[PDB]
Amino acid sequence: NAIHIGPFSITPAARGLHYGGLPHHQWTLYYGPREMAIKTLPDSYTSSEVRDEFSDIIAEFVIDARHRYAPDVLE
Amino acid sequence: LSTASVLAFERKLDPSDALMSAGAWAQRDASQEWPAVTVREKSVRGTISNRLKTKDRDPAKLDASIQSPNLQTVDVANLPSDADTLKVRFTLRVLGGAGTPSACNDAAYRDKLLQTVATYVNEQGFAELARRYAHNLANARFLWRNRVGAEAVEVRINHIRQGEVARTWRFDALAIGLRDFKADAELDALAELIASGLSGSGHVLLEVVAFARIGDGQEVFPSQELILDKGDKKGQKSKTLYSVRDAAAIHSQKIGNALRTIDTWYPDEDGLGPIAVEPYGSVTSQGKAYRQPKQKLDFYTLLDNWVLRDEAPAVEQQHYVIANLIRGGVFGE
Amino acid sequence: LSTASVLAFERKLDPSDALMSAGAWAQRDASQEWPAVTVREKSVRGTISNRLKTKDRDPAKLDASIQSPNLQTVDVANLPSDADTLKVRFTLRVLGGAGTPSACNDAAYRDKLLQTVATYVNEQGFAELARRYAHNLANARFLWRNRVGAEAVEVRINHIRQGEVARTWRFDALAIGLRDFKADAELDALAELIASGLSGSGHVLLEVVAFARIGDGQEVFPSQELILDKGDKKGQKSKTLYSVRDAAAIHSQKIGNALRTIDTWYPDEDGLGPIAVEPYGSVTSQGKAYRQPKQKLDFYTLLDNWVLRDEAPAVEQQHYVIANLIRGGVFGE
Amino acid sequence: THDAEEWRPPTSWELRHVVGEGSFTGVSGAAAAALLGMSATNFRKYTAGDSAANRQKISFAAWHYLLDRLGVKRAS
Amino acid sequence: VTDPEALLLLPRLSIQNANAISSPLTWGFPSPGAFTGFVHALQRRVGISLDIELDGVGIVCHRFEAQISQPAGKRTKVFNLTRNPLNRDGSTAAIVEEGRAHLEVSLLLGVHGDGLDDHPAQEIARQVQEQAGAMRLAGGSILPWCNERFPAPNAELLMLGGSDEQRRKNQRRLTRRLLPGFALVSREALLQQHLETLRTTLPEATTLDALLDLCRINFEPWQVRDKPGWLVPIPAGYNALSPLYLPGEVRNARDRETPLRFVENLFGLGEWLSPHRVAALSDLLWYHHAEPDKGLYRWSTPRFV
Amino acid sequence: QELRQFIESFIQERLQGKLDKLHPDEDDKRQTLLATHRREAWLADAARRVGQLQLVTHTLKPIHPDARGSNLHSLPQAPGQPGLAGSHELGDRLVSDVVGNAAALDVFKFLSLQYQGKNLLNWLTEDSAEAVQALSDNAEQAREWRQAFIGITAVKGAPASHSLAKQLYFPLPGSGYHLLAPLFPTSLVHHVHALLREARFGDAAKAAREARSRQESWPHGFSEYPNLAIQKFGGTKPQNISQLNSERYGENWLLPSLPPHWQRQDQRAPIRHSSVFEHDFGRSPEVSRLTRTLQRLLAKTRHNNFTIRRYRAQLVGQICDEALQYAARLRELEPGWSATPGCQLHDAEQLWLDPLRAQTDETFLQRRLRGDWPAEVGNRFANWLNRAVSSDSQILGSPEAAQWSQELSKELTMFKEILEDERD
Structure with a gap:
C-alpha cells in the first residue's frame, strides 16, 4: 500500500518487525529513483499519519528547490 | 474516644538518592575522585519466550511469529572494564519526635x-528498633541486586555532627547476615546513636558508603523509572534507569524500603x-x-x-x- | 496445585560486555596495552541485487534503476594493517542458587x-551442564563470526579469587570442536569449578580472553546496533556497530547466547x-x-x-x- | 524546449510535478482538464504510467499551453 | 508593606523529591506559597524564640531537575512515578500521579525585630540553619550536608545600616553569591498592561495569560512575537468559592480549632530575572497577605520596582 | 410546554435508541421499561437515576483516589485581585461534571435534549411552569419530573473535607490561621483544554502550520506550546469522575512554569581549543537565539521607534544579563583554573572567567593571575556585540540608532562595573 504525494512515493518494507513489543514497518520515501528517507512507523498508523510523518522532509525539499531554481532579478 | x-x-529516617560510582578495590579509602557510573543505551534482539495460549500452539503460527524479529532499546549500566568495585553513597538524617x-x-x-x-x-x-535499623545499615540491604553474588561488601558510616566527621563505623556487610539480628559493640554504639536521634535528644546525620566488589565491567542495578505506555503510538524504550546529574542512582524510597525491613x-x-x-x-x-x-x-x-x-x-x-x-x-x- | x-x-552466568583490541601473535602474553579496535565510517555504493517483483522486471526500468545507484555510510571495524590477532576480553561470574x-x-x-x-x-x-558451559568457554564460540576462518584461536581463562589470578587455563579453541563434547583433564577441572559455582559452594569470577589469528587489516565483527530512521541529516547511515566508550564491542547477551549453546x-x-x-x-x-x-x-x-x-x-x-x-x-x- | 524536433513528451512522473493534488502547483486533474478544455477521463488517460494501460502521451501544444496556464513556463 | 531591618541568606539549599505540579495548570517550578509557608513555619519553630519576625521570601533557583520523560512519539512529556505498596488484598494500588523534582535554591528572608540587639548575627544564622536542616520545603526533603563544605554559613546583612553607597556595595557583594540563578518576581502590572492593550480586540482575561507565555508565531506581513524577559505562569493565590466556616461545622478538618473555607486557585504571571537587574535587594521578598472579608488569600512581592 | 409535542418525539427517539438492542425475551422487557418512560412517564426514570447523582463545576475527585466530599459548584464571580486569573469570570459555557457514580447519563443528555429552543431542559431544575407541558401527562408525571430536575443540580450544603483533600493553613495578618481546601477546577481545566485543543489541533492551526512550514502567507498566525506535561486521572477507568471523556481519558495537560535553564548539568562551555582562544564564541543556544533575534530587528519605524527602541534596549540588557549568567555558570564549574592548549585568549577569557585564587595566580600574580582585568573583557564583549549587531550607516540617522549606541555603551559600562566590583 504505497502512498503517492505528487512525485514522491512512500512504500513499506514488505515485512515488519517488532519494536518495543509492537509491530512496525519501515517506510521509505523516494523522489523517483532517489531514496530520500526511511522511518520505522508502527502498524495501526493511518495513511494520513504516514503522510505527515514525511511532510516536513517534503517541505524542506520544496524550500530548497524554490531557493535553488529561483529566476534572475533585474533592478 | x-x-x-x-x-x-x-516520616523519620529521611534518606538521599544513593549515587553510584566505580573504582578499584584497596583504593576505597581514596574513593572521593571516583567517577560516576553512567547510564548507556543498547539494542536487544530476543525471541518468543513467554507462555503461549492453548489456542496458539499451532507450529506454523509459532514459526511465523519467530520470523518477525523482536527488538528493544534498553537502558543499561555497567562498571568500567578496569574497575571492579561499585561505591554507593547516600545520606540519612534522623530527626526525632x-x-x-x-x-x-x-x-x-x-x-x-x-x-x-x-x-x-x-x-x-528505641533500642530494639534502633538496633534493627543499625542492622539494616550494617549489612548492605540497600544494595538490592548489587549485593547478590558480590565477593565482598563493606559499609562505612560517618556520623557528621559539625562540618567534619564526628564518628566512623566500619562493617563487613557479608559477615552480618540478612536473616538474624546479632549484637556487636560497634553495632550497639551505632544503635545508641540512632536511638538518641530518634528520641528527640539530638539531630543525627549520617553518610553511608557501601563498597561492593563485583568484577571488571560487570552490570550494576540502579533504580528503574516508571513510563506509562503510549499505547496507540510508536514502540518505546522498554527500560529506563534512574539518574541524578548523569550518575546512576537508586531512589530514596528504595533505600527507605530497604532500611525498614x-x-x-x-x-x-x-x-x-x-x-x-x-x-x-x-x-x-x-x-x-x-x-x-x-x-x-x-x-x-x-x-x-x-x-x-x-x-x-x-x-x-x-x-x-x-x-x-x-x-x-x-x-x- | x-x-x-x-x-x-x-540469570546465573552473568557475562560482561566483551571488548576488542588488536595486536601481533606471540605477543599475546604481553597483551595488556594492546590498543582497542576502533569503529570507523566508510562509504558504500549499493548495487541492485534484490529479487524483483516481476511487475517491475521491464528492462528499461531496470537500467534506469542501475543508472542511479544509492549510497550509504557504514560503520566498519578492521584490524590495523600491522596487527594480525584480535583479542576479545570479558568477565563472567557464576553465582549459584x-x-x-x-x-x-x-x-x-x-x-x-x-x-x-x-x-x-x-x-x-551440575557436572553435565557445567561441562557443556566449560566446553562453550573452551572453544571460542562467543567469537561469533570472528572465529570463522581463523588460523588459530587460543583461549586464556583465569579464575580470579582475590584481586589476583587464582588459576589459569589455556585452550586451543579449534582443537575443541563446536560439535561434540570431549573429555579433558583441564576442561574437567574448569567444569568442576563452574559446578562448584553453580551449587552455591563458592563465588566464581572468571576472566576470559580469546585470541584469534585472522590476518593483517582484516575485518572484525563487533555487535551491531539498531537504526530506526535514516535521512540526509545524517550521513545516510545504515549500519551502526556497538561500542563501549572508544572500542569495538560485543553485547553481553551475545556472549551469553553463545555460552548456553x-x-x-x-x-x-x-x-x-x-x-x-x-x-x-x-x-x-x-x-x-x-x-x-x-x-x-x-x-x-x-x-x-x-x-x-x-x-x-x-x-x-x-x-x-x-x-x-x-x-x-x-x-x- | 520549444524546438519540436528535440522535444519529447513528459513521463507520468514528470507530469506529476505540475498536475495532481500533491504536485508543486497544487492543481488537481479536474482543474487541469478544465484548463485544456477536456474531460476528466480523457485527461486521466495521460496520468496512467505505462503505455499498455490505455495511456497516450500529451501533445506539444497541449503540454506547452498547460505550462502556460499553470504559471510555470511563460511559453510566448 | 513593611521594610525589613535586615536580610538573611539561606545560601544553597539542595532539595530532593520536591513537588513539581503544585497547581492544576502548571507543572514547572513550585508555587511561591510553599516558600511563604516555609518561612512562616520557620518563624513558628525558631523565629518566635529569638524576638525575631520573618516576613517574606526571595527565591532564585540555582538549578532544576524534573523527574519527567518524553514518550518517544510525541512532543509532550509525562511524569515519572513510584511503585506504591500493595493493597490489603494484595492485588495492586490505584495509580495517582505525582510529579517529583530536584531543586537548588537560595532563600532571602527579611527581619524586623531585635536582630543584632539580643543576639549576634552569626549565632542567629547558625541556629536558623540548624533548624531548617531538619524539615522539608515543598513536599520534598531538604537534602542535608554533602561534600559542599564551602557554601555552609549564612549572611545576616543589615538592610539600612551604614552609608547608602556602602549599602549598595554590601548588597552587591551579597548579590555576588547569587549570580548563578535568576530571581522570581510577580508581574501583575505587566499582565494588566497587556490585558488592557489586548481588550481592544476582545474582553477576556485568561486568554491573555495563555497568549502571554507561549511562542506566538506570526505569519508573513514567519516571525516570533516576543516578551523581553522570562514570562511564566504562576499560581497567583487563593480565592474562596465558599463563605467562612467555623472549626466544628465541617467534617474531616485538619483541626477543630481553626476556621475553614473552600477555595479555588488564582493564577497569574511571574518573571525570572537576573539578580543584578534589581538595585535594591529588598525588592524580591514574597509576602503573603490575607483579606479575609472576601476570598483573597494572596502571595506576591509588592515594592519591587 | 414541549413535552406534549416535541418531548414526545425526544422520548420516542430515546425509545428507538433503547430498542435498537431489542430482542424477544429480555429486549422486549427492556423496550417495555423504556416505553414506561418514553411517552410521558420520564419522571419515573428521573426518580430512578435523575436526581441521585449530581455534581458541581469544581469536583473534589482528583484531590485523592477516593476522598469523601461535596464538589460544590458555587463562586460565579470573584474579581477581587486585579493581578490574577481563574474562576473570576468563566462566563462562556461554564460546564459541569456529573460528580458521583451514576451511570444514568441519559438524564444528563435529556437536560440538554429539550434545553435548546425549549424551556423544559432549562426550567426543569426550578420554575417548572413549562414542565407542566413538559411532562405531557397529569400532575404526577410533572411532579416527578420537577422533583428529579430539582434534585439534579442540588447543592450538597453540608461541607465535608477528607484526609485526602489537601487541607492547608494560611496565616492571618498578625493573628492565627485559616484552613483551606482547594477544589479541582474541572470547568476551568476543561475550558483551557478546549482552548489548547483549538490551538494545537484544528484546521486553522493546520493551515497556519502549513503556511509557516513553507514561507508563504496566511492572514493569521498560530500557537505552539512547548513542554506541555501530561497528568493522568484515576487509571484505566477514567470515569470515576465525570468530565473525563474517551479522548480525555484523565488527560490533564499542564503548561510549563520552568526556570530558564532546564539542562546542561555538565559544563557545556569549557576553555577548549576553539573556545579558549575566542572567548566570545558564545557557546549557548539561548544566547545565540537571542543574538539572532536582536540582529533581525533592523528596520526603523516612523512612530513605533519610541517603543521599539526601548524594546531593543531591553533585549540588549537581557543579552548582557545572559552573558553575566553564562560567566557565573562557567565560574561554578572551574575547580582547576589551569591554562591548556587552545586557551590563547587566557589574558582576557582566562581573566574574566578567572576561578578562585590558585597557587600560580597568587598575590605575586596580583596583576597576572589575580588581576582585575574588566576592561579587556568589556572590549571583547563589545566586539562580540558589534559583530552580532552590525549597525547600519544610516541607522543612527533617526534617534533609534543613537539610542541603541547609548544602550550598548550603558550596558557595557554596567558589565564593566559588575566585573570590576567582582574583580576581587
Missing part, C-alpha cells in the same frame, strides 16, 4: 496518642526473614499481604486497641506499631 | 519447585549440533522452533509435568529444564 478523622505522620503527628483533628485523641508513645518510650527505649513478628512465619513495615504488611515480590485484618495483628486494629481501648499489645507488636509510627503514613477514614 | 501467576528467575525464583505468588508452588530442584541436585550435580537433546535431530537453551528452543538464523509445544518437549510442558504432576522426564530433558532455569526468564501468566 474515637480515632481522629485526619491523622498524618511525617516520632510520636507527634503532622495533622490530627481530635485533640483528646492526639493527647492520648502522645501519652501512649511517651509511656512506650518510658517502658523501654525489620518486621520479624508477622504471624505467617519467622524463617522467611524480615519484611518491611507497613499497615497490612505486604511485600510486592510475594504479591501477598501478611498481617491480614481478619487476624488482629495489622497496624490499624493494634493502634485502636492500644489507644482507644487501652489494650496494650505484646512488646514485639508495640515495636511493630512504633516502627510504623517512624515510617509514617496518611491514616484515616 | 497449579502454577504461579508471576514467577521470574534472575539456580532454583530459587526472584518472584512468586504461590508458596506451595515455590516450595514444590525448590524441592524438585533439590532432588535434581541430589541425583546428579548446549542443547543437544532437541527431538528433531542431533547431527546438526547444539542450539541455545530457550523455551520452545528456537534459532533466529533458521526461523524455526525446535521443541514445539505440539510435541511434549518444550520447557513449559516439561516443567509443569515435573513439578505439578511429578512426571520427572528423562535425564537429558531434566538437564534441559535446569539449564532453562539457569538462563532465567519471565515464566507465568
Whole structure:
C-alpha cells in the first residue's frame, strides 16, 4: 500500500518487525529513483499519519528547490 | 474516644538518592575522585519466550511469529572494564519526635496518642528498633541486586555532627547476615546513636558508603523509572534507569524500603526473614499481604486497641506499631 | 496445585560486555596495552541485487534503476594493517542458587519447585551442564563470526579469587570442536569449578580472553546496533556497530547466547549440533522452533509435568529444564 | 524546449510535478482538464504510467499551453 | 508593606523529591506559597524564640531537575512515578500521579525585630540553619550536608545600616553569591498592561495569560512575537468559592480549632530575572497577605520596582 | 410546554435508541421499561437515576483516589485581585461534571435534549411552569419530573473535607490561621483544554502550520506550546469522575512554569581549543537565539521607534544579563583554573572567567593571575556585540540608532562595573 504525494512515493518494507513489543514497518520515501528517507512507523498508523510523518522532509525539499531554481532579478 | 478523622505522620529516617560510582578495590579509602557510573543505551534482539495460549500452539503460527524479529532499546549500566568495585553513597538524617503527628483533628485523641508513645518510650527505649535499623545499615540491604553474588561488601558510616566527621563505623556487610539480628559493640554504639536521634535528644546525620566488589565491567542495578505506555503510538524504550546529574542512582524510597525491613513478628512465619513495615504488611515480590485484618495483628486494629481501648499489645507488636509510627503514613477514614 | 501467576528467575552466568583490541601473535602474553579496535565510517555504493517483483522486471526500468545507484555510510571495524590477532576480553561470574525464583505468588508452588530442584541436585550435580558451559568457554564460540576462518584461536581463562589470578587455563579453541563434547583433564577441572559455582559452594569470577589469528587489516565483527530512521541529516547511515566508550564491542547477551549453546537433546535431530537453551528452543538464523509445544518437549510442558504432576522426564530433558532455569526468564501468566 | 524536433513528451512522473493534488502547483486533474478544455477521463488517460494501460502521451501544444496556464513556463 | 531591618541568606539549599505540579495548570517550578509557608513555619519553630519576625521570601533557583520523560512519539512529556505498596488484598494500588523534582535554591528572608540587639548575627544564622536542616520545603526533603563544605554559613546583612553607597556595595557583594540563578518576581502590572492593550480586540482575561507565555508565531506581513524577559505562569493565590466556616461545622478538618473555607486557585504571571537587574535587594521578598472579608488569600512581592 | 409535542418525539427517539438492542425475551422487557418512560412517564426514570447523582463545576475527585466530599459548584464571580486569573469570570459555557457514580447519563443528555429552543431542559431544575407541558401527562408525571430536575443540580450544603483533600493553613495578618481546601477546577481545566485543543489541533492551526512550514502567507498566525506535561486521572477507568471523556481519558495537560535553564548539568562551555582562544564564541543556544533575534530587528519605524527602541534596549540588557549568567555558570564549574592548549585568549577569557585564587595566580600574580582585568573583557564583549549587531550607516540617522549606541555603551559600562566590583 504505497502512498503517492505528487512525485514522491512512500512504500513499506514488505515485512515488519517488532519494536518495543509492537509491530512496525519501515517506510521509505523516494523522489523517483532517489531514496530520500526511511522511518520505522508502527502498524495501526493511518495513511494520513504516514503522510505527515514525511511532510516536513517534503517541505524542506520544496524550500530548497524554490531557493535553488529561483529566476534572475533585474533592478 | 474515637480515632481522629485526619491523622498524618511525617516520616523519620529521611534518606538521599544513593549515587553510584566505580573504582578499584584497596583504593576505597581514596574513593572521593571516583567517577560516576553512567547510564548507556543498547539494542536487544530476543525471541518468543513467554507462555503461549492453548489456542496458539499451532507450529506454523509459532514459526511465523519467530520470523518477525523482536527488538528493544534498553537502558543499561555497567562498571568500567578496569574497575571492579561499585561505591554507593547516600545520606540519612534522623530527626526525632516520632510520636507527634503532622495533622490530627481530635485533640483528646492526639493527647492520648502522645501519652501512649511517651509511656512506650518510658517502658523501654528505641533500642530494639534502633538496633534493627543499625542492622539494616550494617549489612548492605540497600544494595538490592548489587549485593547478590558480590565477593565482598563493606559499609562505612560517618556520623557528621559539625562540618567534619564526628564518628566512623566500619562493617563487613557479608559477615552480618540478612536473616538474624546479632549484637556487636560497634553495632550497639551505632544503635545508641540512632536511638538518641530518634528520641528527640539530638539531630543525627549520617553518610553511608557501601563498597561492593563485583568484577571488571560487570552490570550494576540502579533504580528503574516508571513510563506509562503510549499505547496507540510508536514502540518505546522498554527500560529506563534512574539518574541524578548523569550518575546512576537508586531512589530514596528504595533505600527507605530497604532500611525498614525489620518486621520479624508477622504471624505467617519467622524463617522467611524480615519484611518491611507497613499497615497490612505486604511485600510486592510475594504479591501477598501478611498481617491480614481478619487476624488482629495489622497496624490499624493494634493502634485502636492500644489507644482507644487501652489494650496494650505484646512488646514485639508495640515495636511493630512504633516502627510504623517512624515510617509514617496518611491514616484515616 | 497449579502454577504461579508471576514467577521470574534472575540469570546465573552473568557475562560482561566483551571488548576488542588488536595486536601481533606471540605477543599475546604481553597483551595488556594492546590498543582497542576502533569503529570507523566508510562509504558504500549499493548495487541492485534484490529479487524483483516481476511487475517491475521491464528492462528499461531496470537500467534506469542501475543508472542511479544509492549510497550509504557504514560503520566498519578492521584490524590495523600491522596487527594480525584480535583479542576479545570479558568477565563472567557464576553465582549459584539456580532454583530459587526472584518472584512468586504461590508458596506451595515455590516450595514444590525448590524441592524438585533439590532432588535434581541430589541425583546428579551440575557436572553435565557445567561441562557443556566449560566446553562453550573452551572453544571460542562467543567469537561469533570472528572465529570463522581463523588460523588459530587460543583461549586464556583465569579464575580470579582475590584481586589476583587464582588459576589459569589455556585452550586451543579449534582443537575443541563446536560439535561434540570431549573429555579433558583441564576442561574437567574448569567444569568442576563452574559446578562448584553453580551449587552455591563458592563465588566464581572468571576472566576470559580469546585470541584469534585472522590476518593483517582484516575485518572484525563487533555487535551491531539498531537504526530506526535514516535521512540526509545524517550521513545516510545504515549500519551502526556497538561500542563501549572508544572500542569495538560485543553485547553481553551475545556472549551469553553463545555460552548456553548446549542443547543437544532437541527431538528433531542431533547431527546438526547444539542450539541455545530457550523455551520452545528456537534459532533466529533458521526461523524455526525446535521443541514445539505440539510435541511434549518444550520447557513449559516439561516443567509443569515435573513439578505439578511429578512426571520427572528423562535425564537429558531434566538437564534441559535446569539449564532453562539457569538462563532465567519471565515464566507465568 | 520549444524546438519540436528535440522535444519529447513528459513521463507520468514528470507530469506529476505540475498536475495532481500533491504536485508543486497544487492543481488537481479536474482543474487541469478544465484548463485544456477536456474531460476528466480523457485527461486521466495521460496520468496512467505505462503505455499498455490505455495511456497516450500529451501533445506539444497541449503540454506547452498547460505550462502556460499553470504559471510555470511563460511559453510566448 | 513593611521594610525589613535586615536580610538573611539561606545560601544553597539542595532539595530532593520536591513537588513539581503544585497547581492544576502548571507543572514547572513550585508555587511561591510553599516558600511563604516555609518561612512562616520557620518563624513558628525558631523565629518566635529569638524576638525575631520573618516576613517574606526571595527565591532564585540555582538549578532544576524534573523527574519527567518524553514518550518517544510525541512532543509532550509525562511524569515519572513510584511503585506504591500493595493493597490489603494484595492485588495492586490505584495509580495517582505525582510529579517529583530536584531543586537548588537560595532563600532571602527579611527581619524586623531585635536582630543584632539580643543576639549576634552569626549565632542567629547558625541556629536558623540548624533548624531548617531538619524539615522539608515543598513536599520534598531538604537534602542535608554533602561534600559542599564551602557554601555552609549564612549572611545576616543589615538592610539600612551604614552609608547608602556602602549599602549598595554590601548588597552587591551579597548579590555576588547569587549570580548563578535568576530571581522570581510577580508581574501583575505587566499582565494588566497587556490585558488592557489586548481588550481592544476582545474582553477576556485568561486568554491573555495563555497568549502571554507561549511562542506566538506570526505569519508573513514567519516571525516570533516576543516578551523581553522570562514570562511564566504562576499560581497567583487563593480565592474562596465558599463563605467562612467555623472549626466544628465541617467534617474531616485538619483541626477543630481553626476556621475553614473552600477555595479555588488564582493564577497569574511571574518573571525570572537576573539578580543584578534589581538595585535594591529588598525588592524580591514574597509576602503573603490575607483579606479575609472576601476570598483573597494572596502571595506576591509588592515594592519591587 | 414541549413535552406534549416535541418531548414526545425526544422520548420516542430515546425509545428507538433503547430498542435498537431489542430482542424477544429480555429486549422486549427492556423496550417495555423504556416505553414506561418514553411517552410521558420520564419522571419515573428521573426518580430512578435523575436526581441521585449530581455534581458541581469544581469536583473534589482528583484531590485523592477516593476522598469523601461535596464538589460544590458555587463562586460565579470573584474579581477581587486585579493581578490574577481563574474562576473570576468563566462566563462562556461554564460546564459541569456529573460528580458521583451514576451511570444514568441519559438524564444528563435529556437536560440538554429539550434545553435548546425549549424551556423544559432549562426550567426543569426550578420554575417548572413549562414542565407542566413538559411532562405531557397529569400532575404526577410533572411532579416527578420537577422533583428529579430539582434534585439534579442540588447543592450538597453540608461541607465535608477528607484526609485526602489537601487541607492547608494560611496565616492571618498578625493573628492565627485559616484552613483551606482547594477544589479541582474541572470547568476551568476543561475550558483551557478546549482552548489548547483549538490551538494545537484544528484546521486553522493546520493551515497556519502549513503556511509557516513553507514561507508563504496566511492572514493569521498560530500557537505552539512547548513542554506541555501530561497528568493522568484515576487509571484505566477514567470515569470515576465525570468530565473525563474517551479522548480525555484523565488527560490533564499542564503548561510549563520552568526556570530558564532546564539542562546542561555538565559544563557545556569549557576553555577548549576553539573556545579558549575566542572567548566570545558564545557557546549557548539561548544566547545565540537571542543574538539572532536582536540582529533581525533592523528596520526603523516612523512612530513605533519610541517603543521599539526601548524594546531593543531591553533585549540588549537581557543579552548582557545572559552573558553575566553564562560567566557565573562557567565560574561554578572551574575547580582547576589551569591554562591548556587552545586557551590563547587566557589574558582576557582566562581573566574574566578567572576561578578562585590558585597557587600560580597568587598575590605575586596580583596583576597576572589575580588581576582585575574588566576592561579587556568589556572590549571583547563589545566586539562580540558589534559583530552580532552590525549597525547600519544610516541607522543612527533617526534617534533609534543613537539610542541603541547609548544602550550598548550603558550596558557595557554596567558589565564593566559588575566585573570590576567582582574583580576581587
